[PDB]
Design a protein around this ligand. Structure first.
Ligand SMILES: [Mg+2]
Ligand SMILES: [Zn+2]
Ligand SMILES: [Zn+2]
Ligand SMILES: [Zn+2]
Lengths: 49, 70, 101, 89, 99, 74, 1173
């Protein structure tokens, strides 16, 4: 993962149960951005027609 | 979630220990003749356990017997 | 997988079914054609409804249509093209156009 | 009457009959049969009906009464027409 | 995931994931007791009739939805229609009586 | 018991296998049996005239030679 | 007037046997060939299991051969191939048949546990099975000869029996024989035979077995069925598309297992038709018959044979019976449960900005969900030429559509449902608010009801389509309409955790801070003082406030006073609506006090003001929680200064008891339990040491010397307020964390001496492991156990609905405080609140009507009761309600999420069960503690299980004595003064007796000790006695766990437990039969002043366990849901049983309106149309 500066305190309820409240600086820094690779395939079959 | 699992454990542990704890009672005072067989109760058992009614001999024996049938 | 009561047959989808979005538009394609043929001339409606299976059984050879009007032949063959030509450009064209994908 | 329905629940007791009566009213309006008896705030017919229950202009009695009235309003128009089914005699 | 109207299973005319526009949410037994505990009589019917099992009802509804008439013309779930045939194909004469 | 494989095996286990000779004991009665009806058929007047009308159908092109006979004794 | 013919909206459903001529009525051709499709042109082969001539066209409105392809041609049967052209739907509707050569036994009526073919002839099964495989001949109508009508002979025997009597006696074998017996057998004749034998020979061994048959016969007569029909002549075939042969990808095919089965049956049948014209020997034509009898059985219900396997595939093939049956019952009605259009789901997140009546729904989701609505509204306002354009528009996600979606979204609720749906609050209706993001935003106050945390749980959405569903979801399922738990009238929308920690810190005071002692005009300027940093939130302050009290005759009175408060409490009053007193916000406000506040707001101002109030509470608590800056660091967890001391002391205590063990003063088992106490004590010392230090030791000064107050340490505020954590859990952070015990339960003799602020070491953690793992293990199984208990309870309730308004009975149960040995384990006010009085209650002095007859005891009444010393009240209960087939509104109570009385039609049976079954998760499934107490102890109660070593009770009053002696059982003889003496029961004299042997004993006394069976209490002590036994002994377990369940619910379950009764007199009913007290109660009324007195009849209420009670249901469709399906239909089909729906389960099955709630109106209105004209 990536460590970050974390501070424990109620923030107007945006961490009510275990929910987490994140600063824009993280998504701007592309740092918890995650790269995924899917494999999609096309098949030429033989049908009765 | 999961928190309750911990909670469950605490209640169980507490109950078991408590039963055990009670099986010793508290400020008792009485005589010295064993109720089963009359053998001499030493004041050590009187002062360790307030209200002891079973000699050391019987306080094994019975315990021992219960184990055997297990 | 899972050994679960998920069985092969439970995933075999129906391909003969007609999804509503299409059953929807078909109920609406009749609407547009109907209104387009009344906003025409009454002869161009009977002429066009006839060349296609539109609310009639079978469709008719363009000659069959000519005898039914007593003015026959090449005559009917032009009324058709102009009626299509009429429904071809806008005011009229707009609505039917959208059915094409 | 959007947030809570409690005020309509007083006017009809059932809390169930409310849902049914209010619906029968809502369809009079959604399928544009009629127009509302109380200012429509761009509220859909769901609540527009519920507003009418609170303000007391729509209940089961009135609807059955208002319905039974139209039955005879439309009966009058067809009168000179359905009578022309003397073809059966 | 979300689905308005999608694929339906062949054997049971029931919402089914086919093009990854996935099948609708499953509305199991416990979720029915939920509606039974409220008075939600219509919400329940629609849930296991036109919203799922009613091969005829689902299209009658969708057409009504776009016409802007919120109604249901329900009729009978195919799930039960197959049971009647499945029972009737055993030695059992299962009928619908009366009127 | 149940499952049919057992109760078939047992039902046919009673019938005892034939001897080298006993095969012909039954074979002889077969010939006798068929022959008895062959002679009973030969004796029937309508059975005769029928084979005449049916043969007269084959020379007039209203049947074929294969439709009626399968060869003779020779 | 004319009746009808074609498809009507049916009511009622009938089941029965099928005549062979009847099966032919359904068939549209005989399937004659084991052929499927062609092998080249994959067309269906005529005429076989798949066929157009018999079943239907392969493609819509198009002839098979192709002559007629025009959609106009419908009723045309093509001259080429007999194929009428209609929808392909009929390949799913049309049945067919096979005519069988030889008869074949229907495996269900032959092998369902009590063989129907067996006891209809009074003939054993192993004999019938013998006839079928040709092992032995059986007589049929033996005539005047030598042989019984049902006697069985062997080959060698039949021959010898034949040589004597040629004709005039007949025997057969194989299916044809059974079919003969049933045909010839006359039930009516045999009925007359069985009537004489009952009265002629007087025997309990004889007439108990005799009567069980005769009623079974005349059932089958008045049924309508003909016994021959259990032998199949004609066999129906299932429409092709329900066992299809559809193609797959890669050009390979897939097909149903019924096809392998049906094929084999067709072949063996055909091969038998051939063998009959080949005059094959009996040894073969028999063997063939045997194979067909097998192949039919493998088709119908495979498994009651040798288990025919599918072709080349080891797995056995799924039969017709296996296609209905399952786990449990009909798969289709079992969860789940059918997938459902217009729905979706994703992860849920927070959104404190929500009003309580709304929720955050992703743009992307709402677009796909309401798609037909958008297509509609789009073309309604004219933005789209046609639907196909609208499709392309929302597909294009043109910005114009967003403004349309917000229209269709406004007054259109959606349903939110989270994972295990436990009570009706598990589904709730919200108004949708559009959200950028792919998560659902869930109002935090509803999190309690859903038992939702945010560790990544997902919820589903559902669109109320029909107009009804919107108004149903808005007036019943909306968030704001259900704020009270239906289990216990208390609010379930209590502020959870973050929000209460907020208010606590706010309405709290410290000794000296900014703003000390000044005075302010009103709440408005108290905020002004704080927001600008002039005053501290918590400082002692007099301010002018104006409270209200509606203490007039429904009229608001105002009071203004200079109240002594704090700045925080001042600011807070700005929320509290009108009629509440300023006293309610003058305190410290913990989670406990914060919910009682919401409660009083409801019971004084009503639903509407409480809702919007409850929103303000959340909004404000969150805001100030953020301002407070409460946190938690290492230095927050303050260890006691004495800890290491306490250890070394209790450590020396073990060293004392150790010295004594080695020197034999104390024994070994003794020493274990000695050490465990001196450790167990020290932990209580360490716990209440830090708790004295932690609680108050913030010692701070005001102008003068020194002072101390409740600590403001972070971690304390959390527990004291109730936001999270308790002195119990805290005890593991600062003080030592207990002793742990291995899974056994035998607690280990060297406790965890370390805590979490310190490290644990190797061993201490490893010991902590056991308790931790079993903890998770347990609660994993405790998930399955909750689920099963609630399921059984709705099965026995369900169909129970509020039906009448007031049954008008004066009968009811006596409510007192529970007083469980110690002091007042539950108040009287709680037991009686929301219930309606049986009879008027009098003061301690009399002539004085306090509450007059049946009045709904709301909060005022309960205090006017508690004002006087009112000690016990009689209240109407569901167990007493005279109304048959339901519960009258009065006898129930009030409870709901709404505070008024229960409405007609509310389906209280279900909601009772849920309320009981939801908290089941919080009960332990171990055993706890001779006495027991836990969740399985509950089921044992609801199941009426007689306990292991019961006590026994006085069967009648009078003087007792012992007679005879120690014969394994010593006879005890009670003898009443006036009545007959005849009771002598033989008691095992090796259980300790408690009865005084020459004393008079009141019927229902303790004649030994130990638990007693609920079956007794009902019988010996009374219907109201047993009902009180259950409610108190079950509530004991819940109330030990801090769970509030109003007795009301437990009572409705009890009602269903004693639904049944047994008869004692005669006249018109069966003297001994067990039946519902309903049917009697109505019918002794239908004889007390009707036909004859006849006589009669007296009955006796009988206690059935929930699982047994539910098992008896009137609707046979309901039974095939949860009972064993094969048995239910078989048992029901011979009887010709007619199901009228009426219940809930079945109407869901058949997919019509539930006969409760909104539907009750309809079913009631339609049920009366029946049995009428
Ligand atoms: Mg979770
Ligand atoms: Zn002793
Ligand atoms: Zn054809
Ligand atoms: Zn009642």
């Amino acid at each position: 993962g990536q460590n970050m500066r974390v501070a424990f305190m109620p923030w107007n309820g945006y961490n009510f149960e275990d929910s987490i409240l994140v600063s824009e600086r993280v998504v701007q820094e592309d740092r918890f951005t995650t790269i995924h690779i899917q494999e999609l395939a096309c098949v030429s079959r033989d049908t009765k027609l | 979630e999961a928190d309750e699992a911990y909670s469950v454990t605490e209640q169980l542990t507490m109950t078991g220990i408590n039963r055990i704890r009670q099986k010793i009672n508290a400020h008792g005072i009485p005589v010295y003749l064993c109720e089963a067989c009359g053998n001499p109760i030493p004041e050590a058992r009187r002062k360790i356990f307030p209200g002891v009614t079973l000699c050391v001999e019987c306080q094994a024996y019975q315990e021992r017997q219960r184990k055997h049938y297990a | 997988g899972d050994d679960e009561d998920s069985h092969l047959g439970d995933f075999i989808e129906d391909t003969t079914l007609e999804l509503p979005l299409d059953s929807a538009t078909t109920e609406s394609l009749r609407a547009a054609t109907h209104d387009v043929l009344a906003g025409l001339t009454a002869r161009e409606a009977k002429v066009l409804r006839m060349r296609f299976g539109i609310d009639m059984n079978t469709d008719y050879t363009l000659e069959e249509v000519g005898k039914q009007f007593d003015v026959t032949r090449e005559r009917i063959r032009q009324i058709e093209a102009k009626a299509l030509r009429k429904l071809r450009h806008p005011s009229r064209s707009e609505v039917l156009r959208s059915f094409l994908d | 009457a959007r947030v809570t329905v409690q005020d309509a629940v007083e006017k009809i007791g059932n809390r169930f009959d409310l849902v049914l009566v209010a619906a029968r009213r809502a369809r009079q309006m959604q399928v544009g049969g009629k127009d509302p008896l109380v200012p429509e705030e761009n509220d859909k017919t769901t609540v527009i009906a519920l507003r009418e229950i609170e303000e007391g202009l729509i209940n089961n009695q009135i609807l059955d009464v208002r319905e039974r009235q139209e039955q005879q309003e439309q009966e009058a128009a067809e009168l000179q027409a359905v009578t022309a089914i003397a073809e059966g005699r | 995931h979300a689905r308005s109207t999608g694929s339906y299973s062949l054997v049971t005319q029931q919402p089914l994931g086919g093009k990854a526009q996935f099948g609708g949410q499953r509305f199991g037994e416990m979720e029915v007791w939920a509606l039974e505990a409220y008075g939600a009589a219509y919400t329940l019917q629609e849930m296991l009739t036109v919203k799922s099992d009613d091969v005829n009802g689902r299209t009658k509804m969708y057409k009504n939805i776009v016409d802007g008439n919120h109604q249901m013309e329900p009729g009978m779930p195919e799930s039960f229609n197959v049971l009647l045939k499945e029972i009737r194909s055993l030695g059992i004469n299962i009928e619908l009586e009366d009127e | 018991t149940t499952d049919p494989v057992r109760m078939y095996m047992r039902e046919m286990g009673t019938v005892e296998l034939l001897t080298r000779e006993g095969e012909i004991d039954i074979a002889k009665r077969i010939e006798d049996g068929i022959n008895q009806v062959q002679c009973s058929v030969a004796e029937y007047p309508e059975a005769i005239t029928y084979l005449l009308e049916q043969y007269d159908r084959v020379e007039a092109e209203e049947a074929r030679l294969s439709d009626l006979i399968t060869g003779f004794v020779d | 007037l004319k009746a009808q013919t074609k498809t009507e909206e049916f009511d009622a459903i009938k089941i029965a046997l099928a005549s062979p001529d009847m099966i032919r009525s359904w068939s549209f051709g005989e399937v004659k060939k084991p052929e499927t499709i062609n092998y080249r042109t994959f067309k269906p082969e005529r005429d076989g299991l798949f066929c157009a001539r018999i079943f239907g066209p392969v493609k819509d409105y198009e002839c098979l051969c192709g002559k007629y392809k025009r959609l106009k041609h419908r009723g045309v049967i093509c001259e080429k191939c007999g194929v009428e052209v209609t929808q392909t739907k009929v390949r799913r509707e049309r049945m067919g048949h096979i005519e069988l050569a030889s008869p074949t036994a229907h495996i269900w009526f032959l092998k369902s546990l009590p063989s129907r073919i067996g006891l209809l002839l009074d003939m054993p099964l192993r004999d019938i099975e013998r006839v079928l495989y040709f092992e032995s001949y059986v007589v049929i109508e033996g005539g005047m000869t030598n042989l019984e009508r049902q006697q069985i002979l062997t080959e060698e025997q039949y021959l010898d029996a034949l040589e004597e009597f040629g004709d005039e006696f007949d025997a057969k074998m194989g299916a044809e024989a059974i079919q003969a017996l049933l045909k010839s057998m006359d039930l009516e004749q045999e009925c007359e035979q069985l009537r004489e034998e009952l009265n002629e020979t007087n025997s309990e061994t004889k007439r108990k077995k005799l009567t069980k048959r005769i009623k079974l016969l005349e059932a089958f007569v008045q049924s309508g069925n003909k016994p021959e029909w259990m032998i199949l002549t004609v066999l129906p075939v299932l429409p092709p598309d329900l066992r299809p042969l559809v193609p797959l990808d890669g050009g390979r095919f897939a097909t149903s297992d019924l096809n392998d089965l049906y094929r084999r049956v067709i072949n063996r049948n055909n091969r038998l038709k051939r063998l009959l014209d080949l005059a094959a020997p009996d040894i073969i034509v028999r063997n063939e018959k045997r194979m067909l009898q097998e192949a039919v059985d493998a088709l119908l219900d495979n498994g009651r044979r040798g288990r025919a396997i599918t072709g080349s595939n080891k797995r056995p093939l799924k039969s017709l019976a296996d296609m209905i049956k399952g786990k449990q019952g009909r798969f289709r009605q079992n969860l789940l449960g059918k997938r459902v259009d217009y729905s979706g789901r994703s992860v849920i997140t927070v959104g404190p900005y929500l009003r309580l009546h709304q929720c955050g729904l992703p743009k992307k989701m709402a677009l796909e969900l309401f798609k037909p609505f958008i297509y509609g509204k789009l073309e309604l306002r004219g933005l789209a030429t046609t639907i196909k354009a609208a499709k392309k528009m929302v597909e294009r996600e043109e910005a114009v559509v967003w403004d349309i979606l917000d229209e269709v979204i406004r007054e259109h609720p959606v349903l939110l449902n989270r994972a295990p749906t436990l009570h009706r609050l598990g589904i709730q209706a919200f108004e949708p608010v559009l959200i950028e993001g792919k998560a659902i935003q869930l109002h935090p106050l509803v999190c309690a009801a859903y038992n939702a945390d945010f560790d990544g749980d997902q919820m589903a959405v559902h669109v109320p389509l029909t107009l009804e569903a919107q108004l149903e979801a808005r007036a019943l399922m909306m968030s704001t309409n259900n704020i009270l738990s239906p289990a216990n009238g208390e609010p379930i929308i209590v502020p959870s955790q973050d929000v209460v920690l907020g208010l606590y810190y706010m309405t709290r005071d410290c000794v000296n801070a900014k703003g000390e002692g000044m005075v302010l005009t009103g709440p408005k300027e108290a905020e002004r003082l704080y927001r600008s940093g002039l005053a501290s939130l918590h400082a002692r302050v007099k301010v002018r406030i104006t409270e209200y009290e509606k203490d007039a005759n429904g009229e608001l009175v105002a009071k203004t006073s200079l109240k002594d408060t704090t700045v925080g409490r001042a600011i807070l009053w700005m929320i509290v609506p009108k009629g509440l007193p300023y006293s309610i916000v003058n305190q410290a406000l913990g989670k406990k006090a914060i919910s009682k506040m919401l409660n009083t707001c409801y019971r004084i101002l009503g639903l509407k003001p409480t809702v919007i109030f409850a929103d303000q509470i959340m909004y404000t608590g969150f805001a100030y929680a953020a301002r407070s800056g409460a946190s938690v660091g290492i230095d927050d967890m303050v260890i006691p200064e004495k800890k290491h001391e306490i250890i070394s002391e209790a450590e020396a205590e073990v060293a004392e008891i150790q010295e004594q063990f080695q020197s034999g003063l104390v024994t070994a088992g003794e020493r274990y339990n000695k050490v465990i106490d001196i450790w167990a004590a020290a932990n209580d010392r360490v716990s209440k040491a830090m708790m004295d230090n932690l609680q108050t030791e913030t010692v701070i000064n005001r102008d003068g010397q020194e002072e101390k107050q409740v600590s403001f340490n972070s971690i304390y505020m959390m527990a004291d307020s109730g936001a999270r954590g308790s002195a119990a859990q805290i005890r593991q952070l600062a003080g030592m964390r207990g002793l742990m015990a291995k899974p056994d339960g035998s607690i280990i003799e060297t406790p965890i001496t370390a805590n979490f602020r310190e490290g644990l070491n190797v061993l201490q953690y490893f010991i902590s492991t056991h308790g931790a793992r079993k903890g998770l293990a347990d609660t994993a199984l405790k998930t399955a156990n909750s689920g099963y208990l609630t399921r059984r309870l709705v099965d026995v309730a369900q169909d129970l609905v509020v039906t009448e308004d007031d049954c008008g009975t004066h009968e009811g149960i006596m409510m007192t405080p529970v007083i469980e040995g110690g002091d007042v384990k539950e108040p009287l006010r709680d037991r009686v609140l929301g219930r309606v009085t049986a009879e008027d209650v009098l003061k301690p002095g009399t002539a004085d009507i306090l509450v007059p007859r049946n009045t709904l005891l709301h909060e005022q009444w309960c205090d006017l009761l508690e004002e006087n010393s009112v000690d016990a009240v009689k209240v109407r209960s569901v167990v007493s309600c005279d109304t048959d087939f339901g519960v009258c509104a009065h006898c129930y109570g009030r409870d709901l999420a709404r505070g008024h009385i229960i409405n007609k039609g509310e389906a209280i049976g279900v909601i009772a069960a849920q309320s009981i079954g939801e908290p089941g998760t919080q009960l332990t499934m171990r055993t706890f503690h001779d006495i027991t107490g836990g969740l399985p102890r509950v089921a044992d109660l609801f199941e009426a299980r007689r306990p292991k070593e019961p006590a026994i009770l006085a069967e009648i009053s009078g003087i007792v004595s012992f007679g005879k002696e120690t014969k394994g059982k010593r006879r005890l003889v009670i003898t009443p003064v006036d009545g007959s003496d005849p009771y002598e029961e033989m008691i095992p004299k090796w259980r300790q007796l408690n009865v005084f042997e020459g004393e008079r004993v009141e019927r229902g006394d303790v004649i030994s000790d130990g638990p007693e069976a609920p079956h007794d209490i009902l019988r010996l002590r009374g219907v109201h006695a047993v009902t009180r036994y259950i409610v108190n002994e079950v509530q004991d377990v819940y109330r030990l766990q801090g769970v509030k369940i109003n007795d009301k619910h437990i009572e409705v379950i009890v009602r269903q437990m004693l639904r049944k009764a047994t008869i004692v007199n005669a006249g018109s009913s069966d003297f001994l039969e067990g039946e519902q007290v309903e049917y009697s109660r109505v019918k002794i009324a239908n004889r007390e002043l009707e036909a004859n007195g006849k006589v009669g009849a007296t009955y006796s209420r009988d206690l059935l366990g929930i699982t047994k009670a539910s098992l008896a249901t009137e609707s046979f469709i309901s039974a095939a849901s949860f009972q064993e399906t094969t048995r239910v239909l078989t048992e029901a089909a011979v009887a010709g049983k007619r199901d009228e729906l009426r219940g809930l389960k079945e109407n869901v099955i058949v997919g019509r309106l539930i006969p409760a709630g909104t539907g009750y109106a309809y079913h009631q209105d339609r049920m009366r149309r029946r049995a009428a004209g």
